């Protein structure tokens, strides 16, 4: 099904401003973002989601920064940004889960401070 | 648990403006969307449209799109669907229900469902 | 609009039978589809989404298959809770649309 080129942790620092998360398919065959269904979770909770149909983003309110750059989804990035004040209180394991057209998989990324 | 309690039964004269009500509990109500579905006497599931409390987003379908306005108040989190000047056309049952955060949109919570009834 | 054809308009079976229900779309949806049962009197009940995955609570009787244009709800063992209409509903392309419906009434 889809896969990723994964990447077990990142880390950031007082000197971080912002944090990404990395989340990259390899083999997406979407022609159109309309076809694309991004959710990323955090501790068994959608933190973020990207309404590909609708095309709208949908974040809670303990992550009010975080988002990912539209333009690259169809090239496979799904990273998530967010701002450092939102990560600080949310270190651990996120999870990225991809739907695309007919396909579906996730992946885990963890995020540590240093 | 996820709720969503509409208002009662309306009966009302052609002409006359409407406004029923959806109030979501049991959930973040600004984070889901929340989808009208119209169902005329022994007819098919109809979806009007849906709305996004968080910032007001409406979608229309382009058969109720200036027929109908759908609108959400997130302090009492509670969606609203509004006619200006009903019709006798318009008499029908009118359910509220919350759109599923997944791919293919679907209505996992429905409200028990308003009936409107309008005649001279 | 993707237009959704259901079909057939009424299936008179016996309990205890299986049933086939068909959903044509106009065009591909992508797995993106799904499937309500409703009662009189009462609103309508979700079963599938995705195709294929089953709601929460939903028995295992009920069975989704398909993609792109041509889907199918499967009922392996008819019970006498399961006579009802049974809706398909696309959720790919805005706007969202039903189907228009089928009934599966007892045969005797």
């Known amino acids: 099904q889809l896969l990723f080129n994964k990447t077990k942790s990142v880390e950031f620092t007082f000197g971080n401003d912002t944090v990404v998360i990395p989340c990259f398919v390899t083999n997406m065959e979407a022609q159109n973002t309309t076809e694309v269904y991004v959710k990323w979770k955090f501790k068994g909770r959608d933190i973020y989601t990207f309404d590909g149909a609708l095309n709208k983003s949908t974040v809670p309110t303990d992550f009010s920064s975080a988002k990912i750059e539209v333009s690259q989804l169809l090239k496979g990035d799904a990273s998530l940004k967010m701002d450092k004040s939102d990560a600080v209180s949310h270190t651990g394991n996120y999870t990225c889960e991809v739907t695309e057209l007919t396909r579906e998989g996730e992946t885990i990324i963890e995020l540590k401070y240093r | 648990e996820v709720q969503l309690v509409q208002s009662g039964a309306e009966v009302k004269k052609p002409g006359e403006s409407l406004k029923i009500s959806c109030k979501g509990s049991?959930?973040?109500?600004?984070?889901?969307?929340i989808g009208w579905v119209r169902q005329m006497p022994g007819k098919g599931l109809e979806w009007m449209g849906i709305?996004?409390?968080?910032?007001?987003?409406?979608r229309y379908s382009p058969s109720f799109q200036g027929q109908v306005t759908i609108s959400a108040d997130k302090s009492i989190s509670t969606a609203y669907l509004q006619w200006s000047s009903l019709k006798a056309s318009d008499t029908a049952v009118y359910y509220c229900?919350?759109?599923?955060?997944?791919?293919?949109?679907?209505?996992?919570?429905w409200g028990q469902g308003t009936l409107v009834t309008v005649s001279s | 609009e993707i237009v959704l054809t259901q079909s057939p308009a009424t299936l008179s079976l016996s309990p205890g039978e299986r049933a086939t229900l068909s959903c044509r779309a106009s065009?591909?949806?992508?797995?993106?589809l799904a499937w309500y049962q409703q009662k009189p009197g009462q609103a309508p009940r979700l079963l599938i989404h995705?195709?294929?995955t089953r709601a929460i609570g939903i028995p295992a009787r009920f069975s989704g298959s398909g993609s792109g244009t041509d889907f199918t709800l499967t009922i392996s063992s008819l019970e006498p809770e399961d006579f009802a209409v049974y809706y398909c509903?696309?959720?790919?392309?805005?706007?969202?649309?039903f189907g228009q419906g089928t009934k599966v009434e007892i045969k005797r």
């Open positions: 229900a919350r759109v599923g955060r997944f791919a293919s949109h679907q209505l996992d919570y």
């Open positions: 049991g959930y973040s109500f600004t984070d889901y969307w």
């Open positions: 709305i996004y409390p968080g910032d007001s987003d409406t």
């Open positions: 065009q591909s949806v992508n797995n993106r």
């Open positions: 995705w195709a294929s």
């Open positions: 509903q696309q959720g790919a392309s805005w706007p969202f649309t």
